[PDB]
Amino acid sequence: EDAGLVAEAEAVAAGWMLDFLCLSLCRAFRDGRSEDFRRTRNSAEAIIHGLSSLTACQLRTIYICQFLTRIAAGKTLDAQFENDERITPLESALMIWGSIEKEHDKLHEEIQNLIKIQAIAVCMENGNFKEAEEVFERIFPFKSKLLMIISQKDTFHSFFQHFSYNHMMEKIKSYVNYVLSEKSSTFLMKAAAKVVESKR
Amino acid sequence: EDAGLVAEAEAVAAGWMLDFLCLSLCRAFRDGRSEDFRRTRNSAEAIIHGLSSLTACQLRTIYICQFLTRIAAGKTLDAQFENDERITPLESALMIWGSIEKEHDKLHEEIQNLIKIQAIAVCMENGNFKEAEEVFERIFPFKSKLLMIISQKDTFHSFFQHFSYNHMMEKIKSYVNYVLSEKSSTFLMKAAAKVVESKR
Numbered sequence: 171e172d173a174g175l176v177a178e179a180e181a182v183a184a185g186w187m188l189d190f191l192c193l194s195l196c197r198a199f200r201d202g203r204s205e206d207f208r209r210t211r212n213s214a215e216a217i218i219h220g221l222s223s224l225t226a227c228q229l230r231t232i233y234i235c236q237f238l239t240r241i242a243a244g245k246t247l248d249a250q251f252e253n254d255e256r257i258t259p260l261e262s263a264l265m266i267w268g269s270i271e272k273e274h275d276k277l278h279e280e281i282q283n284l285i286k287i288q289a290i291a292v293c294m295e296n297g298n299f300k301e302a303e304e305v306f307e308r309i310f311p312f313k314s315k316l317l318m319i320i321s322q323k324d325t326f327h328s329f330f331q332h333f334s335y336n337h338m339m340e341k342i343k344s345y346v347n348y349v350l351s352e353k354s355s356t357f358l359m360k361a362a363a364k365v366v367e368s369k370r
Numbered sequence: 371e372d373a374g375l376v377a378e379a380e381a382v383a384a385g386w387m388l389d390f391l392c393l394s395l396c397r398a399f400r401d402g403r404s405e406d407f408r409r410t411r412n413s414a415e416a417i418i419h420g421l422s423s424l425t426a427c428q429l430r431t432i433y434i435c436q437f438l439t440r441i442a443a444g445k446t447l448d449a450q451f452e453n454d455e456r457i458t459p460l461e462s463a464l465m466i467w468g469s470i471e472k473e474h475d476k477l478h479e480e481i482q483n484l485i486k487i488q489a490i491a492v493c494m495e496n497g498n499f500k501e502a503e504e505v506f507e508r509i510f511p512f513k514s515k516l517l518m519i520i521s522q523k524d525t526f527h528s529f530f531q532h533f534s535y536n537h538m539m540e541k542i543k544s545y546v547n548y549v550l551s552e553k554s555s556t557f558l559m560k561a562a563a564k565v566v567e568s569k570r
């Protein structure tokens with residue numbers, strides 16, 4: 171048994187598992203299957219730990235998984251995460267979004283701006299206006315209007331009608347559909363569907 | 371998109387991932403690659419969470435993974451595990467070993483008895499003789515001789531030369547070799563090795 175060749179085969183298989191789990195995570199996020207999403211995230215994250223060297227395509231895949239994980243935790247309070255990074259989950263999604271190797275097109279800008287405003291609005295929704303102001307300071311005439319909105323607890327100001335949580339989720343889901351189509355043909359899902367259509 | 375067929379394809383792929391990760395765990399245990407073992411265990415355990423219904427073969431696979439995990443933790447102190455089960459890792463390996471659907475042959479009996487004596491001896495090795503006596507009481511003329519050994523702190527008594535930790539590890543590794551050969555041809559490892567030999 172050649173240990174080098176066994177390690178190489180384990181790396182090929184981890185690459186296949188990563189693409190399959192990204193695909194599974196994308197569909198669970200699109201479908202709103204929260205429990206399936208957290209189980210798939212736990213699996214993808216553990217599989218990622220077994221990899222030491224990543225290609226450009228694999229890095230893009232792990233950062234898409236990290237970004238969707240932060241978006242899904244957008245309205246959830248995680249004590250240890252807040253003490254370690256000193257920022258909120260949507261602010262962490264914003265850092266990943268602005269650093270992924272991808273085209274900065276119209277959809278990219280729309281998603282970026284929707285996350286920026288929702289990082290403040292989710293704090294107002296939870297009743298933490300002091301935190302809403304701290305988020306605003308870390309991210310940012312337009313600024314003076316946004317600061318007056320937070321200060322007046324004007325959570326339902328018309329500005330948030332265009333820059334809503336539902337609009338942020340819809341734009342991100344449209345991006346997820348492109349990722350889903352690009353990976354729909356990856357080895358593991360393709361072979362698994364072949365077994366299903368033959369059964370039957 | 372048929373959601374039922376997608377869920378079915380995800381179940382087929384999880385079955386493939388489980389067999390591959392069991393194979394990887396078996397080799398890491400045989401090779402003494404501790405860090406690779408804990409990374410593979412984390413991956414196998416997360417993948418197992420994504421499964422709700424298991425065949426007889428899949429149950430045998432998850433219990434082999436659980437047993438090797440307890441054997442690997444044999445000399446390690448885990449506070450939360452001790453408070454939850456009120457037993458040591460080798461005693462938990464013994465419960466799994468005696469309940470797996472497998473032939474109770476000569477090798478099975480040898481491994482069983484080696485774990486029983488090592489569950490006491492690892493406590494003596496760590497200097498906890500009160501715990502060695504509590505382990506003895508939960509598991510058990512031969513008994514009176516074993517009780518006198520613990521009581522006299524006779525850790526290097528000739529009885530432990532035949533029933534040693536190294537002999538327990540060797541017998542378990544011989545069993546691991548049978549599991550390794552039975553799964554050497556499973557879909558994921560087989561396809562991954564094909565890619566490696568073609569590259570080279």
Ligand SMILES: C[C@@H](CO)N(C)c1ncc(Cl)cn1
Nearest residue numbers: 211212214215218235236239
């Ligand atoms: C950077 C890490 C830390 O838990 N992270 C948020 C993460 N999230 C999802 C996946 Cl699949 C992998 N990693």
Ligand SMILES: C[C@@H](CO)N(C)c1ncc(Cl)cn1
Nearest residue numbers: 411412414415418435436439
């Ligand atoms: C029963 C569980 C609890 O952590 N257990 C010891 C476990 N160990 C290994 C694997 Cl791969 C799955 N499960």
